[PDB]
């Protein structure tokens, strides 16, 4: 019952012939899976730890200058030399000043001058990298039972926490009373940590692209250095000034922390204080429900009186949740729950807390059901004291279809081709679609990498216009489709 | 000579006394006493409840 109260909850119904299903777990999202004869389960990816990170480069965001020295040659005598031009902890510059009898040369002209200052770092960014085999994903499996200790809670009293690694990617969770669930995950295709850097600047951290991190215009150390003193692009944090041609000075360029923050827009912030914790990204797992059984199917209907201790409350997903207590005699018993019409002639809705059962008498159990659009009645108990609860669902079936399609499009926009593994049960249509999406996404990422969202919108409009003003129908339709998809992606992206 | 100050920008700041308040769904906006003071930079957002 953990996914109740999360806006990004997903409902996965059905398994394949093998009693397995493909689910992609995202950090901010919850997945609830349902099969014809299995307990309802909630899946949450609650952690992603990167372990044993290695630095590959330390950038300097704030430096200072000291030990400034200058050399000069009187005109026509070539460029001057300083001992510090060979010292790597010094930043040097060559210029021309004006010399003459007043300055102390004896020839009139442009005499070369060089000034050097010792470059020191005061604050840096350590861009650690981690091996893709050091990633660890923690996934909580909570049975959607109705027992009070799991109604939207973010604790582990009833939820079972299974840790998944690239090495041990197949694990099973023992769910007391429901058998076991086997998770066959593929963390290696999850986020591709070999092309990413863990960027820790001060008390804030980000997950960034390794090419972007290696292209930064700041000075850097290789990460194997323990003393600094060999910064590479020291010229990026200094400026040499020769106003007119009378002096050459050199100054540092002030703390770059805020410029780095601006540069980090579009990078998902992570945590790196007490280990490298990443609360972003997804994990594709194949869920095996074959050894998964409903708890209490060998129970008798309660035949007693229920009381609604908490009124029926609607969630963001079109389902409803109701908390009922039991006051009858057969303690462990199946709860007689139905969602019918007023005349109780038809069954209109399905319950999500499949097989609700009263484990204890004065122990409230809260059922989740999905009632139909419009009027429906929740009937709890049997005739001697049966309670009938009116409910009204405000939406529409066409609106629900539109929202489902939009969620599908957004999943494709965020997971790309991994969205074809969400709720997948094999099938040839799914495989064909995933292959086509893989090829098209390769082309699209090649053509749109490094482009902002405004540029994507502009390109989409341009391509759509080209297609619309196209004489051939096939090329017209293809370009219009590409342009509309480009526009949707530009409107959905955060870039 | 005799310059007059036109405007003072901030290039480095610190944040303190962070507080939050929330309003349950459909019940309007929440309120902090700190929104009265201009020394506080406040932000309104929506949170799953």
């Amino acid at each position, epitope marked *: 019952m953990r996914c109740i109260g999360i806006s990004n909850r997903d409902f996965v119904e059905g398994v394949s012939g093998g009693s397995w299903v493909d689910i992609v777990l995202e950090h901010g999202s919850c997945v609830t899976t349902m099969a014809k004869n299995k307990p309802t389960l909630d899946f949450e990816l609650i952690k992603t730890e990167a372990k044993h990170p290695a630095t590959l480069r330390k950038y300097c965001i704030e430096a200072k200058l000291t030990n400034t020295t200058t050399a000069s040659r009187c005109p026509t005598q070539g460029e001057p030399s300083l001992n510090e031009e060979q010292d790597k902890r010094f930043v040097c510059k060559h210029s021309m000043v004006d010399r003459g009898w007043g300055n102390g040369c004896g020839l009139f002209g442009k005499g070369g001058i060089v000034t050097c200052a010792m470059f020191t770092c005061k604050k840096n960014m350590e861009g650690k990298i981690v091996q893709p085999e050091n990633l660890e994903y923690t996934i909580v499996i909570t049975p959607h039972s109705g027992e009070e200790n799991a*109604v939207g*809670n973010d604790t582990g009293k009833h939820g079972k926490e299974i840790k998944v690694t690239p090495q041990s990617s197949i694990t099973e969770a023992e769910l007391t009373g429901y058998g076991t669930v086997t998770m066959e995950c593929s963390p290696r295709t999850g986020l591709d940590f070999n092309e990413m850097v863990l960027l820790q600047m001060e008390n804030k951290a980000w997950l960034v692209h390794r090419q972007w991190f290696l292209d930064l215009p700041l000075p850097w150390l290789p990460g194997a250095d323990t003393q600094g003193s060999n910064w590479i692009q020291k010229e990026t944090l200094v400026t040499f000034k020769n106003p007119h041609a009378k002096k050459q000075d050199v100054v540092v360029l002030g703390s770059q922390e805020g410029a780095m923050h601006t540069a980090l827009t579009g990078a998902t912030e992570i945590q790196m204080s007490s280990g490298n914790l990443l609360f972003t990204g997804h994990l594709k797992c194949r869920l095996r429900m074959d050894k998964l059984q409903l708890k209490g199917m060998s129970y008798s209907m309660c035949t007693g009186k229920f009381k609604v201790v908490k009124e029926i409350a609607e969630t963001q997903h079109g389902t409803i949740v109701i908390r009922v207590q039991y006051e009858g005699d057969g303690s462990p018993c199946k709860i007689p729950f139905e969602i019918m019409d007023l005349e109780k002639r038809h069954v209109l809705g399905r319950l999500i807390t499949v097989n609700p059962i009263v484990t204890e008498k*004065d*122990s409230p159990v809260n059922i989740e059901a999905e009632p139909p659009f419009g009027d429906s009645y929740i009937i709890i108990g049997v005739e001697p004291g049966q309670l009938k609860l009116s409910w009204f669902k405000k939406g529409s079936s066409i609106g629900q279809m539109f929202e489902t399609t939009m969620r599908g499009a957004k999943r494709m926009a965020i997971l790309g081709d991994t969205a074809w593994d969400f709720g997948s049960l094999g099938g040839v249509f799914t495989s064909i679609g995933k292959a086509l999406h893989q090829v098209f996404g390769a082309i699209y990422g090649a053509a749109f990498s490094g482009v902002s969202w405004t540029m994507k919108i502009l390109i989409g409009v341009v391509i759509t216009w080209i297609g619309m003003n196209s004489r051939s129908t096939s090329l017209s339709v293809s370009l219009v489709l590409v342009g509309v998809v480009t526009l949707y992606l530009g409107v959905m992206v955060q870039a | 000579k005799h310059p007059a100050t036109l405007r003072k920008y901030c290039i480095e700041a610190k944040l303190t006394n*962070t507080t*939050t308040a929330s309003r349950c769904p459909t019940q309007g906006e929440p309120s902090l006493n700190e929104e009265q003071d201009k020394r506080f930079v406040c932000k309104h957002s929506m949170v799953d409840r």
Partner: antibody, heavy 119, light 110 residues
Framework: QLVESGAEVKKPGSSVKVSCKASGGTFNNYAISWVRQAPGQGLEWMGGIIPIFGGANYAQKFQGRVTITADRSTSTVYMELSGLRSEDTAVYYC??????????????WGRGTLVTVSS | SVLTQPPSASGTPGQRVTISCSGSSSNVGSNYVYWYQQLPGTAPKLLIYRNNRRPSGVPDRFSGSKSGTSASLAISGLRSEDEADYYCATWDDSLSGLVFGGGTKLTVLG
């Protein structure tokens, strides 16, 4: 751990603010409630707050008279009483419970701050 | 409607005593009931939470009872330590707040 501010002596019509610092885990994963006990009397719940979320809930008796606030930077929970009177003399406790609307077990309590209106 | 308890309760060492917490369906019978043991000059100690549940580290002599609208707390064996005020707390839906039992002091003899 739940540490409360020291005892305070006030006067009628004045105000007293009681603080209750808490650890990081208990601040961001739990809720803090305020319960008073007048000497020789039963506990009385005044209100509480989910410090991560704010927006305190107040008992009807103390509605308009109390203000519970949480300082996220210092991970401290504050309680302020306005219009103090003799009948408001009592020891005030800050207690920790889960941040769920159904479970109200205060498994961890502060020592308790006593507010008096006399010398 | 609100929680009500006997103001005082007597007993003898090595006895069984049950304290009753009576409320309306709004507070007791529609929500959990919590029992707190407070010693003189000390913050109350959580004794029973939810219903008939004992927090880890509490002796088994304490047992809570929940009826359709009323609740009780029973003590297995009595001692001088049991002499203390006992409160029952329960969320009230109509009052929109937590209501305490009002107190019940166990007066062990001897």
């Amino acid at each position: 751990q739940l540490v409360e501010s020291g005892a305070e002596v006030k006067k009628p019509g004045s105000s007293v603010k009681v603080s209750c610092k808490a650890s990081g885990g208990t601040f961001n994963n739990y809720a803090i409630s305020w319960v008073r006990q007048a000497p020789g009397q039963g506990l009385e719940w005044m209100g509480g707050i989910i410090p991560i979320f704010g927006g305190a809930n107040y008992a009807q008796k103390f509605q308009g008279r109390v203000t519970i606030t949480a300082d996220r930077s210092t991970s401290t929970v504050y309680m302020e009483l306005s219009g103090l009177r003799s009948e408001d003399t009592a020891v005030y406790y800050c207690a920790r419970r889960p941040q769920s609307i159904f479970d109200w077990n205060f498994d961890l309590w502060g020592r308790g701050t006593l507010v008096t209106v006399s010398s | 409607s609100v929680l009500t308890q006997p103001p005082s309760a007597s007993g003898t060492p090595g006895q069984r005593v049950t304290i009753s917490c009576s409320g309306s369906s709004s507070n007791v019978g529609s929500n959990y009931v919590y029992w707190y043991q407070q010693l003189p000059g000390t913050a109350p100690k959580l004794l029973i939470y939810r219903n008939n549940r004992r927090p880890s580290g509490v002796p088994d002599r304490f047992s809570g009872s929940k009826s359709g609208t009323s609740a009780s707390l029973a003590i297995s064996g009595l001692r001088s330590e049991d002499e203390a005020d006992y409160y029952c707390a329960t969320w009230d839906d109509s009052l929109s707040g937590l209501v305490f039992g009002g107190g019940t002091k166990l007066t062990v003899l001897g």
